[PDB]
Amino acid sequence: KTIIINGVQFNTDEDTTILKFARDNNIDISALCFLNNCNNDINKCEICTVEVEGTGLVTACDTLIEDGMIINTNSDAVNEKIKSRISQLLDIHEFKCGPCNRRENCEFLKLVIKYKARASKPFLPKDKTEYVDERSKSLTVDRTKCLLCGRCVNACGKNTETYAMKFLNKNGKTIIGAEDEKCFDDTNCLLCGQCIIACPVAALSEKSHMDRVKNALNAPEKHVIVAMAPSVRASIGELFNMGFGVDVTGKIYTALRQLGFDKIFDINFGADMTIMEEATELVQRIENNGPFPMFTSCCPGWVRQAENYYPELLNNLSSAKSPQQIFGTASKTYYPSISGLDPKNVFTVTVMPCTSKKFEADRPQMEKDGLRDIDAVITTRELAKMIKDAKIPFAKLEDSEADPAMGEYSGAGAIFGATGGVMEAALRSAKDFAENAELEDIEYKQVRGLNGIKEAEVEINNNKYNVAVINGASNLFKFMKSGMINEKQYHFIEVMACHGGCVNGGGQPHVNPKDLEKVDIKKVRASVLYNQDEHLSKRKSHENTALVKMYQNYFGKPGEGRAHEILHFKYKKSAWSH
Numbered sequence: 001k002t003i004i005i006n007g008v009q010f011n012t013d014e015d016t017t018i019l020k021f022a023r024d025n026n027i028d029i030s031a032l033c034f035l036n037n038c039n040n041d042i043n044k045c046e047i048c049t050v051e052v053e054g055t056g057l058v059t060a061c062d063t064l065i066e067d068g069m070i071i072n073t074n075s076d077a078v079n080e081k082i083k084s085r086i087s088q089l090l091d092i093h094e095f096k097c098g099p100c101n102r103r104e105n106c107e108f109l110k111l112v113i114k115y116k117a118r119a120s121k122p123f124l125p126k127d128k129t130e131y132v133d134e135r136s137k138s139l140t141v142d143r144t145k146c147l148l149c150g151r152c153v154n155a156c157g158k159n160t161e162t163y164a165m166k167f168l169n170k171n172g173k174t175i176i177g178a179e180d181e182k183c184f185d186d187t188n189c190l191l192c193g194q195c196i197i198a199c200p201v202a203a204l205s206e207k208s209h210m211d212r213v214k215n216a217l218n219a220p221e222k223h224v225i226v227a228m229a230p231s232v233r234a235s236i237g238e239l240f241n242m243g244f245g246v247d248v249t250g251k252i253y254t255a256l257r258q259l260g261f262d263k264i265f266d267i268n269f270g271a272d273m274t275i276m277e278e279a280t281e282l283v284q285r286i287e288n289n290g291p292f293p294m295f296t297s298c299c300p301g302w303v304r305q306a307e308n309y310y311p312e313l314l315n316n317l318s319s320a321k322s323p324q325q326i327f328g329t330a331s332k333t334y335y336p337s338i339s340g341l342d343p344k345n346v347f348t349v350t351v352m353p354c355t356s357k358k359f360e361a362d363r364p365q366m367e368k369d370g371l372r373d374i375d376a377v378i379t380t381r382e383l384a385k386m387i388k389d390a391k392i393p394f395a396k397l398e399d400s401e402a403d404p405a406m407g408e409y410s411g412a413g414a415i416f417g418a419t420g421g422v423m424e425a426a427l428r429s430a431k432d433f434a435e436n437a438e439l440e441d442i443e444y445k446q447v448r449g450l451n452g453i454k455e456a457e458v459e460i461n462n463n464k465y466n467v468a469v470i471n472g473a474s475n476l477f478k479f480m481k482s483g484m485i486n487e488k489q490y491h492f493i494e495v496m497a498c499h500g501g502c503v504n505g506g507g508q509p510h511v512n513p514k515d516l517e518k519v520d521i522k523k524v525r526a527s528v529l530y531n532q533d534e535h536l537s538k539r540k541s542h543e544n545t546a547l548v549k550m551y552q553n554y555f556g557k558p559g560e561g562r563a564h565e566i567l568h569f570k571y572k573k574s575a576w577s578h
Ligand code: SF4
Pocket: 093, 094, 095, 096, 097, 098, 100, 101, 102, 103, 104, 106, 107, 108, 109, 145, 201, 202, 203
């Protein structure tokens, strides 16, 4: 068919929207509420307005192209409409970009500038108490920024299928929030933060821990440990104009030292620990025959999903603590034993791509003798802001190393941040443990990739077992509801709340819709992790020399005695009541 756009003739056969056809042909059309192939069906922002000859003004983001169409995207009538919509949004938006946390990458600000729009009356409330919800340990809402674009609502539905984020009618006004306007933590919400990643403005944010950290750094008697997650070294560089998929590991260690942290360790070291305990546990359940299947328990998003939707599976979860929590436990016990520090004075901080990790760290029972496993969790975004505030030229920094005692990590622990990572890492150790050997081929590419549900047959000690990798909370629901759990006998299953793995977590850097269609962010970030695994001398968790001497000198045998006593954590369904 034939269509005219701004005087240019196109002969196409494709059946698609005006917006996406224009994007494919270097024609600029603005958009706001359109994301993940969905717009706000109930309250269209109409930023994507174009003019179709013979019809009038139409929304390009949900209008299909058709033969005989003559389209104009930059007429005066079009621009007047768009500018008007942005103006109306400014009438309900506290326009103070100064101290805003989305100052450097806000979609709305760029639209205001582009169309040079202004408010009819500047929205200025001098008491944001009614507009702000900070009850959650993971999420925060500022409704002075909310455009009601519904992107959070759609994102939650598609990613989790919980629909925990909803449109609400608060006193006759329309808002977004949790069920019955409750605290998110008190609902079926997973605290995965996918609603944040979809937010075009600073309406949705993580619960800040930056004050916890700064007060600890300035406390004379406090010894502050810092340790980053796998995905951070593959991501944070984006917020310093370094592009995508840049390994900035060495730069982070340097920046963390200039920030004043007293010790530089790594969560990947803790990931090797989780494997030591979990791989041991897998071999245990084999010889004891069950309980099968065993589910991973390192994702607090999936834990909450199980607790809220599938409590009968809680006993099937691995007792091994998550890399963050298992690391923290050792930071307050093992680390003082080799440093002389008073355990009370140790302050453990982690850097995560995750908002759910905040809720996990503040779990009441996640402590021992009054000492928290983890005292503070800051996101990838929070660390980046901390660096810029201290005016540290991150991009120019020289590479340094972490402190080895709890900083060394194998390639197995390095790939934790990608879907199927824990699965593969665990099989590298579990296979050696059961067969009592040191195998050569350790790459399980069948469990890798962005497929929603991934299963494979593996052979452990002359016997075949079935494993599965659930990629995204929505795929867990699919996996269970469709009855795939019963089709065959599974023995070991990985579950991750965020599709793509932790590299796509809720605490990660925002990426505008434009770059997302250009870049496979989930694969580009993950590639950094796998590339480290390929070049590392040690590619098995139990070959981690620093970890070996820790177990030899302090803990003992994994899955036994002391190691089982303090490095493990069991979830149990609530007892019967009425
Ligand atoms: S949300 Fe965006 S436009 Fe609004 S104050 Fe913050 S940076 Fe400025």
